[PDB]
Amino acid sequence: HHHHHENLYFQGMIIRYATPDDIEDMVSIFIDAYNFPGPRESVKSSFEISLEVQPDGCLLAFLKDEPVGMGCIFFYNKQAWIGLMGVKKAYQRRGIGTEVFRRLLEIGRRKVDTIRLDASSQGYGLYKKFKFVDEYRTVRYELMERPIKRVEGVVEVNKIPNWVKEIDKKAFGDDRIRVLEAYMRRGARLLCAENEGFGLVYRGKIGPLVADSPRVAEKILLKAFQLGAREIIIPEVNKDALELIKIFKPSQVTSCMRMRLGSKIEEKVDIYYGILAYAKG
Ligand SMILES: CC(C)(COP(=O)(O)OP(=O)(O)OC[C@H]1O[C@@H](n2cnc3c(N)ncnc32)[C@H](O)[C@@H]1OP(=O)(O)O)[C@H](O)C(=O)NCCC(=O)NCCS
């Protein structure tokens, strides 16, 4: 004997837990992998939030100090979400994403019995190899025009009330309040109608949007648009959500297929109009 390596061998690469010192690299991987033409700071702030939500959730793949690939797992009580998968285009299609995902699953299986995600066209085939099954599509729409229609009765609140925690638990099927909180530390606005619905507005995005009726969801969405919301990701199985957004003359941006490994989570998707993020569920 001679050389002593205390990790599995995988193509001469190093895969390890990310820390906040790795934010710039994560951002670079993401912008490469997703061909993101937007401003950098946008991604940096999003990833700072992700590491607050799950400090030990991010795996990074390195080929000799060059950052090549990443992915994340976010834990709730009954399920975890895998999101933010990305391998730099020069390094794609040689098994790196598959390996990062394997490792994430390994971590997830010890803690929870259901793992879910929102799959793009490139990812879909990877996740299917691990026996992920289709749930329903989650469709990203851009809201183009302001409806000529006033609303009254929607307020922004600085602390999450218990009734919001309860209606979100019902919509999502789990506890993700720490995610809402992390976004609100960065300026995200919590809009509430009556005690029957809420929406979270962060940058140009509303998510989640949860409402006991289409009329309450509409009130929130109109006020969100006024506060700069231009995008919403709708679960395609909420029949009222697609009809709701039509008054904004929406433009479809992209869709994913939500997928699951393990047992179905009881969720109330009829009240669930806008998912939080493809990364988080
Ligand atoms: C999904 C992604 C992370 C895959 O990473 P990767 O290192 O290239 O994937 P792997 O080499 O391990 O390939 C695993 C499987 O992914 C799927 N895949 C990867 N790239 C693909 C693409 N270009 N088109 C269709 N399927 C693709 C295939 O099923 C592949 O298996 P195969 O080679 O036997 O057919 C992806 O290429 C990426 O970083 N893009 C980012 C944005 C995106 O569209 N996907 C992430 C969100 S779900």
TrEMBL record:
GO molecular function terms attached to this record: acyltransferase activity, transferring groups other than amino-acyl groups
Pinpoint the N-acetyltransferase domain residues: 13-149
Superkingdom per UniProt: Archaea
Residue numbers binding CoA: 87, 93, 95, 97-98, 120, 129
Q: PANTHER family, per this entry?
A: BLL4206 PROTEIN, SLL0310 PROTEIN
UniProt protein name: N-acetyltransferase domain-containing protein
